[PDB]
Every structure is written in structure tokens, then in C-alpha cells.
Amino acid sequence: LVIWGTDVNVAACKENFQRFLQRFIDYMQRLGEINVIGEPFLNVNCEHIKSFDKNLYRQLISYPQEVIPTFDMAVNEIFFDRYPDSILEHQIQVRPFNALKTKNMRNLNPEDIDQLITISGMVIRTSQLIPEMQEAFFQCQVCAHTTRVEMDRGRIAEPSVCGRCHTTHSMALIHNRSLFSDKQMIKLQESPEDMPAGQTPHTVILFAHNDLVDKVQPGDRVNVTGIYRAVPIRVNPRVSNVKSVYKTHIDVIHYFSEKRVELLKELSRKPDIYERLASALAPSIYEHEDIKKGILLQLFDPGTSKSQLLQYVYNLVPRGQYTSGKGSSAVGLTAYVMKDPETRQLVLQTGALVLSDNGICCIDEFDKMNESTRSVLHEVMEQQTLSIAKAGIICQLNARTSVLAAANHTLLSRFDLIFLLLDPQDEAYDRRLAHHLVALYLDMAVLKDYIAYAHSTIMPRLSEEASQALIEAYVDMRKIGSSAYPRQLESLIRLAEAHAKVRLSNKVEAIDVEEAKRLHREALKQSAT
Amino acid sequence: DYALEKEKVKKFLQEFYQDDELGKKQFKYGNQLVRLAHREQVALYVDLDDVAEDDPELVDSICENARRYAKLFADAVQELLPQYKERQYPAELMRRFELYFQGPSSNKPRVIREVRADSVGKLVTVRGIVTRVSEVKPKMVVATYTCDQCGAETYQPIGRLYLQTRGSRFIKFQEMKMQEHSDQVPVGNIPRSITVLVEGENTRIAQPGDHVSVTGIFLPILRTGFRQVVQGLLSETYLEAHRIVKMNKSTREELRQIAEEDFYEKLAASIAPEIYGHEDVKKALLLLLVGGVDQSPRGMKIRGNINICLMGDPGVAKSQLLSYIDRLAPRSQYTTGRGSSGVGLTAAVLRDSVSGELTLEGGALVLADQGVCCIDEFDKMAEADRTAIHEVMEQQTISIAKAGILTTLNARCSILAAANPAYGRYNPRRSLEQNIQLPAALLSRFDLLWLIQDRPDRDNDLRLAQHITYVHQHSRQPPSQFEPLDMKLMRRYIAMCREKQPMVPESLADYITAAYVEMRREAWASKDATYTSARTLLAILRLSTALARLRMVDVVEKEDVNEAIRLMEMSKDSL
């Protein structure tokens, strides 16, 4: 007795696993927490258990579609015997978390179907609600008996097994308890963030159901486990001629450095990295170092070093998105609202700003933006989220992001900050600039983690060390020629936010606020007439 | 000879892995075999040259019957596994394990036009230029189907039956388009390009535009189907590309007396013959006909781009020369303002019938990887086509941000351009952006701007009269003694200059900045419409950086900087 279609013996490892659930102990705290509280739906990891049992294990991915059932049985064989006088109607289906090291579904085989897998991706979109049919019954004709079909247990969720008598679902389904099924598409996007670039990653035909329905949102970051499925592509549903590729779609079943740090700690100990990294930052160009400064903070004449810098930011960073006006409107950021014309139904069509939540926006051509757009940015920046009240999905769009741009409107007030690329009109500085090029004719990855651990770990606090100083400050910043009683403070703190997001110090003083004075000052001065 | 020597090739293949010690006490081909059964390498290539040294059978024979000696190469490899095995078609039957082919120049990379009725069943290699990059899929090959009443695996390549993946035999495949090189078409014909059959680990491998290898060759999996080549229903032999491989890299005055005298004097007098003088422009064309692509390691990635615009179209029939340029220029394509969409330059996507889902195929720029980019009517490239341009500023600039596809392709070419003037002819009273209308913002970006005022110089007109009137007397358009040349020879005269990869004497570091100071000093001092940048300095450098390619110094010299100055002094109201 065997399943040659998947090569599993009669239960084939079962009685190793029944004892496993009792032998795991050091589960035994969790074994009752499911029955006694009523919280089913196991949530394993990349199963580390492989220290216990390999014959149980190797199977885990292997053809385990015939095993997870036996698990959801074998657990319940034990669990129903554990606490049968609890809420035992809570059947258990497993939901792994940070599963086995997926080979980046971009790369997985044609083979790689009966395979528990996980994403390293990002969401493009969700289904929103479209579940599907569950179970059948037709009517036949000896005084028409209503004949169970997929109501008949043992039969299959095929196509064409339900090719007649729709009310024998479509009303009877209510009258006969098969209330239609349940499945949720999603379009995700594999994205390794430093992909080779050009060649591009794999979006997802997600479909699988469970009432983990919608607990993955659009734009979401991934912690997500699944299993493959696919289906041969007909040349037509009207025919049997065959497109010999199967239409992949996935069973959602989800839920050194210290030495570098010590090196960072030296960089952290190092006192003028604000200057040194500035001396390292955007190194490509000579002066306008002052401009180069705030990118670190913000990390924390056409293209005249500009997109370069923004591309330096683009290059430096996964989290961000470069674009600009004048060919790409707000749509290249957001509010590209439009349909899937193959299906003729609106989609929350958007752009870079939706790529930019907890990110850094590299717009250009800010002069070129419309009022049919740029009223977006009138609204965005005062929000850091974007109300999309639209046809299929009325919502708002958290874009809790960062921005910067430059161009060659009363609301410069908002801006992070941009500066004045003006002419020094000095042949010598040109020569210095020329020399910079004539001379032209690692730190990043260190930086890349320098920025990170603070984005991982650090949380400044501007307390009475220097909370006063802000109060001392905008006094000093307002008063000359007496505005800083506006959110300049909230900018200033957003600048003083940085140096303590630098340095791995969660606490702040005048220095590490005081630098931000010069910045906003010089930024005010250079922007002042 | 073919259908019944099965024992030999199996005997042969039984011994050829044994025919040497080059696979470490095994032949190199057997080196992979232990690596095959251990799943170390799974696909295989074959240098067929190693067989002809002792047995041109299976070399000339496979060349006569690729399919059979493909298919027969497999069926031995089918039963050869147990000899190296570490443990109808049994399940593993080369199921993820693959075979390709290679070897001598008997299979030279052939021309997309030269596929034939002879090319059926043929051993088949090709080079040329790539495009039509499909969305890959996996792809089954064998319906490992179910005899449900009977149990164990059953295989069809093809009612109540089910067809089930668990034992079926799949592959990752694509569509591709090889194209002619734009080099072996000195012709009044279309540079042909081909529907390509694309598979294996040679999918997900490469981008358009590349000059490449191929082997467009049948699979061992089937001879014809159930019988020999004669059949009644048959889909197409198209190009079953095996071993697609990039081409990174394929008349001396010392032995001859050729490059000695200044091409930058001479090459003018032997290029642009019909042209009515104004060789000054031709210099940059000569410079671009040199280009600056092959760089030395100083990071000058913008060296490759000689980004020129020419302003105003029935300027001598300057409309013509771009063909002359393309007649010179390989890796070169011509386009026009409003002739097509941006995919005249860029790329776009939709379904196809033959194979591959939504092949991205691209335009001239996508075709011009480090090419020569030639335009009609730059003004009509309205805002859409103004744009990737304004990216192609930046070299590898065909970027995508679309639902399924978000790549960039390597737009790496260099740009000469023809743009009609703003609805009216050039006018000294009207500016660029008044007599031109395109962005100054772009025009700025161009390495140089040059105009050809069709103006009342009655004597030069009278020369032009003399010029054209000499035409249809003859084709002696440069009758002052210049000996014309073969654009291939010119290309050979070009190529040696391309490979120079010079690098200045840093002591010159003054002389440029020295001058660029005074140059930019005067411009910003003069405060006229002329406006420059640091890209000037690059351009300035970049010119000289090409001037020395012809002035084959391998470094750079004063004169080029003095010449590039003189070019700029010649550029001075070149508009």
C-alpha cells in the first residue's frame, strides 16, 4: 500500500511524530495552550527540529501535503486525547514563520513544487476580497435527486466537477451548508535589494486562503512562508490543447558584526565622522560639502552633482526611489489610479512614494510639478500618509517616508532641505574643481551598517541635557531681525535627531544639537536674501 | 550508418570519458560525469573538436545529422549513468541533466538570413545582436501522467486521465531575438533578426544588444517523433540556441605607410566626399567615428559618449550623412523624431505567439549598446522621447518601473542628432529655444552643438555649384587628389585607434585647466548665450581623449588640447 504519485508509505513516519509531540519537551507548554485556551494553527520556524529526527524531518518539504494532514491529524490524535473537554473544535493547521532558506523563487526550479517555501519579497497588492466556490451537489433526473458532487466527500475540487446546476450550490449552498470557499490572491514582489540590476525579480501569484486572509497588506515587508502550486495552461478552456507551462500559484501557509561594530565603535569613538564621513560622502565632488552633510542626516544647473548625489543616495540605499516630474507626474510617486485592463477593474495605482514609506524620496524637477499634482505634496508632507478615497479601495496610504529633491511656492516651509547651487565665479575654484577631475582623470558597506544599527537600535532623547537648548535656540534663531517658533524647532529636533541617531548615543547635548544650528542657519542663510 | 551503430557511440561514449587523463585520471568529459551523477554540474557542453582528432565520425556525422547524433549522444548518456552513478524513461532519465555542444569552426556563427532549407536538421551556430527578452517560465517536457488503476509513474510527452508534475520532466525556457550585427549588412536590405528558441541554464543569462554566441541546435530528446525525419504534421525548426555566449571581445604605417600622416588632416579629405566642405564638423564626426568607448582604468565611463547635436535639416542635405555615418558606423542605427514611439530607441512589451511571454524588445538605443546613435528631427521626439534621452545622458539608462518589469538596459551608445529648427529656419535674432525649441537643458548636455547656416556666400555657393555640377560629371567629389578608402578599412583604420586607451601626461594637468580656466573665464566673462559646464571639461578632455586615438600617442598631447580648444574656438558660434 503506497501513494506512488508522491511516494508516501501508509503513514510512513507517523508513529515517530506522535511520540515527537510528547518527546519534543526540551511543545509541552504549548501542547495544552492550543486545546485549553483554544488557539490552534501551529506556527513553526525554519524547522530547526532537525536535531531531533531526520526521517520525520527530510519529509517536511518533501511530499508533505500528505503529511501536514497526518500532522493536523496526529497532533489532533494526541491533542484530542490531551484535553477532549475543552474547545476541541479548533482544528490545527500549521503556519511556519521565517521558514527554510528559500532559493529566491526567482531561481526555484520548474521542479520545485511540492515544496514548503518562504518569500524574500515585497507586496505589490492584495486580492481584496475574492474568495471562491466550496462544494457541490447537482440535480440529476429520477424525479431529480439533488446529487452531492463535491458535497460528496472523497471527490475533488476540480474544474468541471461543478459544471451544472448553479443554484444547487448558489442557493443550496446556503440551504445545504457548503457556504462558498475561500482563497486570497496577492501580487508580491521578490526583491533582494541589491539585485544584479538590470534583470528583475519575480512577482507572485499568491492565492491561498486561510483566515490569515488580509493579514498581509500591500506594500508589506516579508516574513512569509508558503507552498507552491501550479496548473497547466490550456490553449483555451474551450479546448484541451496545451500550453506546456503550469500556472504557478502558491499555498500561503505563513504565520563578524560585533567586530564590525567594534570598528564602528572606533568610528563611533571617532569625533569628526560628521566631517570624515562628509569627507567620504558624495566624494565625487569638491565643495558644497555642506550640502553633502544632511544626506547623512537625512539618511538618519541640471544634474550638476545632483542626481549623482541622489543617485549616491539611490546607490547607497535600498530604501528609496528616484524619480522626477515632467515626464513622471505624481503617478510615478502615487495616485496613478488605474485598472487591470485584462480584468477591467481599478487598482490602487501609485508609485515611488508607495515605494518610499520609511524611505527617502529622490524627486527631481520639483519646479515642473503641476497643481493637479504637487497638491499631493501639499498634503503628503503635512501627513506622511496619503488619503486615497477611490473606487475599489478607499483608504489612506502611510508614506511615513523621507524626501529630497531640487529644482533649478509658499510651502518651502515643509521641506527637509535643499540648497543653492550658485556660481562661485572663481577660476581658481574651477581649477580646484578641475583639479578634482583632472586628479580624477567599503566605507559604503561600513556606512551601510553604520546607518543601520541606529535604524536598528538607537533612539535619541533630547532631555534637560539640551532640551533647554532648543528653547535657548529658536529664541536665538527667531530673534535675529525680529521664523523659528514655527516647526523649525520640530525641524531642529529632526536635525538634532540625527547626531544621537549617530554615535549610538540615545541622549543628546548642545553639541549634537548645536551642529544643526549651523545647518539650519547656513541653510537659512544660503536660502536667505 | 546512423540508425544501427548505437553500440559504437555507446562504446565510443563508453571510452571517450576514458580517452584521456585530463579529468584527473579520467577525461575532462568524464570529469563532469562524476560531477553529473553527484549533481554538481547538470547541463553539459561538448567541444566536438576533441572527437575529430581521433574520429571525425560523430563530428562530420553530427554535422550531417545533428538530431540523430544529438539524440544518440543522449541515449548513450541515458544508459551511461550506472557506470558513473553514485547510487520508457525511468524518472531520473537526464531529467534535470542537460547536454549542449561546441567545437571547431566547421560551425561558424552564421547569418540570420543564411538559415535555410539546408539548415533543417543542421548543426548550427550564430552570432549577432540580441533582443526580445521574454519572461522566463519553467516548462514541462514530459507528461508524467497517471495510470490510476495501475499505480506507479507513467510518462507521455502528451481523458479521464490526469497529467501530474511529480515525475514530469521540465525546463526553464525563453524566447530571444538575435539580430544582424549592423556590420555584415553594407546593403540595401533590412538587418535581419530571428525568432530564437531558448532554454536551459542559458535562460536568465543575458540582455539585448550583445554580440554573442549561439548554437541554434536541436535537442537530443527526440529525433522526429516515433520515426525518421519524414512526417505529416510538424512545427518549426527555429533557433534552438545552445551555448549562447557573449562577445566581450572577438594596415600599419610600420609595415605600410598609412597612419603616419594626420587622419585629422587626411581623413577629412577622404571622408564626406559629396559634402561641401565644412569638414570641421566632420572632425567630431571623425571623433565619434572614433568614439571614446575603450577606456583606460581612470573611471572615465562618460568617455564613450560623443553626444553631438546638429541644428537645422536641409543643411546641405545633412539629412544624408547620417546614412553616410551609418555607412561608416557599425553598431549604429538611425531614427527620426516622429517616425515611431520611444521604442524606436527604448523598449516595450506585449504577448507573442511562438514562444516566450511578453518579450521586451527595444529600440535603437536598446540596440545601441555603445553604438552610434543617429537621429532625425530631435525636436519631434516629444516629451516621452525627450526623456530616456535625458536619462541616456547617463549611460545604461533604459530604466523600467512597470508592474512586471522594472529593469534598466545598457543604453551605452553615443548620440549625433539632427533637429529641425523651431517652425522656421535659424535666425540670429531668435535664440535657441526660439529658433530651436528643444530644451537648452538637453542641448546643454550635448558634447557639442553645431549649425550649418544655409547662407548667401555666393562664391561658396558658386563652389557648391561647382561642387554639384562636378556631380553627374562623375563621382569625383574630392578631385583634389584624395584616395577615398573602404569604410571597413577605415574601420580598421578606426579600430587601432580605439584600442589605444590613452591616458594623459599628468604634467598636462595644468594645460587643460590652464586653458579651461581662461576658456570658461572668457565665456562667463563675455556673458553671451554660450554656456558651458564641467561636462565641458569632460568633453574637452573627452575630445582630446579621442584625438590622441588617431594621433596614436597612447597618452595625450598639447596639440589635442590646443585642437580641442580650436574645436571649441571653432565651436564658438558654431551656432
DSSP string for B42-84: -EE--BTHHHHTT--TTTHHHHH-HHHHHHHHHHHHHHHHHHH
**How far apart are alpha carbons A211 and A222 in whole angstroms?**
18
Pick A437's closest partner by Cβ from B166, B407, B534: B534
The annotation status of A387 as a binding-site residue, yes or no, is no
**How far apart are alpha carbons B279 and B265 in whole angstroms?**
10
Residue of B nearest to A232 (CA): B163
- CB-CB neighbors (< 8 A) of A121 in chain B: none
Instruction: Give the CB-side neighbour count of residue B93, counting CA atoms within 13 A.
Output: 18
- B534–A304 C-beta distance less than 8 A: yes
- A440–B151 C-beta distance less than 8 A: no
CA distance A110 to chain B (A): 5
CA dihedral over B131, B137, B140, B145, signed as positive or negative: negative
Kindly state the cell numbers that stand for B535. Answer: 561636462
- CB-CB neighbors (< 8 A) of A6 in chain B: 166
Place of cell 540596440: B367
Kindly state the cell numbers that stand for A95. Answer: 503556519
Determine what percent of chain B falls in helix, strand and coil, rounding each to the nearest 5. 35, 15, 50
- A301–B170 C-beta distance less than 8 A: no
- B170–A109 C-beta distance less than 8 A: yes
b/e burial code for range B34-43 (CB count within 10 A of at least 16 → b): bebbeeeeeb
> Contact at 8 Å (CB) between A357 and A320?
no
B299 φψ region: left (φ > 0), alpha (ψ -120 to 50), beta (else) = left
Helix (H, G, I), strand (E, B) or coil at A435: helix
> Contact at 8 Å (CB) between B51 and B29?
no
Residue of A nearest to B148 (CA): A5
**How far apart are alpha carbons B421 and B435 in whole angstroms?**
6
| H or E stretch covering B13 | helix B6-16
CA dihedral over B419, B422, B427, B432, signed as positive or negative: negative
The annotation status of A408 as a binding-site residue, yes or no, is yes
> Contact at 8 Å (CB) between B170 and A109?
yes
Place of cell 535581419: B192
* B424 class by beta-carbon count within 10 Å (0-12 exposed, 13-18 middle, 19+ buried): exposed
CA distance B390 to chain A (A): 10
- CB-CB neighbors (< 8 A) of B509 in chain A: 435, 438-439
**Considering only CA atoms, which of B74, B107, B52, B53 is closest in space to residue B243?**
B107
b/e burial code for range A496-523 (CB count within 10 A of at least 16 → b): bbbbbbbbbbeebbbebbebbbebbeeb
- B517–A434 C-beta distance less than 8 A: yes
DSSP-assigned letter for residue B133: E
Task: Using alpha carbons only, give the angle B370, B373, B378 rounded to the nearest 5 degrees.
Answer: 145
**How far apart are alpha carbons B501 and B292 in whole angstroms?**
8
Residue of B nearest to A441 (CA): B298
> Contact at 8 Å (CB) between B467 and B276?
yes
A304 contacts chain B (CB < 8 A)? yes
In chain A, which among 246-275 make CB contacts under 8 A with chain B? 246, 248
| Single-letter residue type at B348 | A
Place of cell 497643481: A371
- In this structure, the number of other CB atoms found within 10 A of the CB of residue A262 comes to 12
CA dihedral over B406, B410, B414, B418, signed as positive or negative: negative
**How far apart are alpha carbons B445 and A301 in whole angstroms?**
11
What is the DSSP annotation of A161-217?
TT-S-THHHHTHHHHTT--------EEEEE--SS--SSS---B--B----TTTTSS-
**Considering only CA atoms, which of B328, B277, B186, B263 is closest in space to residue B477?**
B277
| Single-letter residue type at B441 | A
CA distance A484 to chain B (A): 37
B234 contacts chain A (CB < 8 A)? no
**Considering only CA atoms, which of B533, B484, B556 is closest in space to residue B273?**
B484
Pick A427's closest partner by Cβ from B96, B298, B521: B521
Instruction: Give the CB-side neighbour count of residue B225, counting CA atoms within 13 A.
Output: 9
The annotation status of B276 as a binding-site residue, yes or no, is yes
CA distance A204 to chain B (A): 10
Expressed in Å, this structure's resolution amounts to 4.4
Task: Using alpha carbons only, give the angle B207, B209, B214 rounded to the nearest 5 degrees.
Answer: 75
The annotation status of A286 as a binding-site residue, yes or no, is yes
**How far apart are alpha carbons B379 and B336 in whole angstroms?**
9
**How far apart are alpha carbons A505 and A383 in whole angstroms?**
29
**Considering only CA atoms, which of B89, B92, B46, B34 is closest in space to residue B70?**
B46
> Contact at 8 Å (CB) between B453 and B313?
no
Kindly state the cell numbers that stand for B95. Answer: 531529467
> Contact at 8 Å (CB) between A320 and A416?
no
**Considering only CA atoms, which of B254, B300, B213, B279 is closest in space to residue B496?**
B254
CA dihedral over B457, B459, B463, B464, signed as positive or negative: positive
Checking DSSP bridges between strand B98-99 and strand B43-44, what pairing results, if any? parallel
Helix (H, G, I), strand (E, B) or coil at B267: helix
Phi, then psi, of A151 in degrees rounded to 5:
-60, -30
* A238 class by beta-carbon count within 10 Å (0-12 exposed, 13-18 middle, 19+ buried): exposed
- CB-CB neighbors (< 8 A) of A431 in chain B: 513, 517
**How far apart are alpha carbons A296 and A276 in whole angstroms?**
11
Q: Superfamily for B252-568?
A: P-loop containing nucleotide triphosphate hydrolases (3.40.50.300)
B520 contacts chain A (CB < 8 A)? yes
Kindly state the cell numbers that stand for A123. Answer: 507586496
Place of cell 516566450: B356
> Contact at 8 Å (CB) between B271 and B263?
no
- CB-CB neighbors (< 8 A) of B538 in chain A: 437
Tell me which of A227, A312, A438 to substitute to probe the interface with B (most B C-beta atoms closer than 10 Å).
A438
- CB-CB neighbors (< 8 A) of B533 in chain A: 301, 304
**Considering only CA atoms, which of A492, A355, A350, A334 is closest in space to residue A416?**
A492
Pick B408's closest partner by Cβ from A4, A6, A198: A198
Residue of B nearest to A323 (CA): B401
Pick B407's closest partner by Cβ from A63, A198, A433: A198
Residue of B nearest to A302 (CA): B441
Kindly state the cell numbers that stand for A253. Answer: 501557509
- In this structure, the number of other CB atoms found within 10 A of the CB of residue B326 comes to 16
Pick B165's closest partner by Cβ from A246, A302, A304: A246
Checking DSSP bridges between strand B133-135 and strand B357-362, what pairing results, if any? antiparallel
- CB-CB neighbors (< 8 A) of B299 in chain A: 440
Helix axes A514-526 and A488-501, enclosed angle (nearest 10): 130
DSSP-assigned letter for residue A505: -
Q: Three-state SS string across A130-168, please?
A: CCCCCCCCEECCCCCCEECCCCCECECCCCCCCCCCCHH
Helix (H, G, I), strand (E, B) or coil at B364: helix
Helix (H, G, I), strand (E, B) or coil at A417: coil
Q: Three-state SS string across A337-375, please?
A: CEECCCCCCEECCCCCCCCCCCCEEECCCHHHCCCCCCH
| Single-letter residue type at B497 | C
In chain A, which among 366-405 make CB contacts under 8 A with chain B? none
Kindly state the cell numbers that stand for B432. Answer: 535657441
Question: A3 to each of A9, A17, A479, B506, how far by Cα in Å?
Answer: 7, 19, 84, 77
**How far apart are alpha carbons B137 and B203 in whole angstroms?**
10
DSSP-assigned letter for residue B144: E
CA distance B410 to chain A (A): 8
- B387–A63 C-beta distance less than 8 A: no
First-to-last C-alpha distance (Å) of chain A: 89
Instruction: Residue count of chain A, please give it.
Output: 529
**How far apart are alpha carbons A63 and A381 in whole angstroms?**
51
**How far apart are alpha carbons A518 and B78 in whole angstroms?**
76
- A245–B298 C-beta distance less than 8 A: no
A5 contacts chain B (CB < 8 A)? yes
Number of H helices, E strands in chain B: 16, 21
> Contact at 8 Å (CB) between B100 and B205?
no
B405 φψ region: left (φ > 0), alpha (ψ -120 to 50), beta (else) = beta
Helix (H, G, I), strand (E, B) or coil at A492: helix
Question: B43 to each of B36, B200, B246, B402, B509, how far by Cα in Å?
Answer: 8, 8, 18, 33, 53
The annotation status of A246 as a binding-site residue, yes or no, is no
| H or E stretch covering B310 | strand B308-311
Say which residues have a Cβ less than 8 Å from residue A401's Cβ, sequence separation at least 6.
A353, A356, A357, A358, A359, A360, A361, A384
- A109–B387 C-beta distance less than 8 A: no
Say which residues have a Cβ less than 8 Å from residue B69's Cβ, sequence separation at least 6.
B2, B9, B58, B61, B62
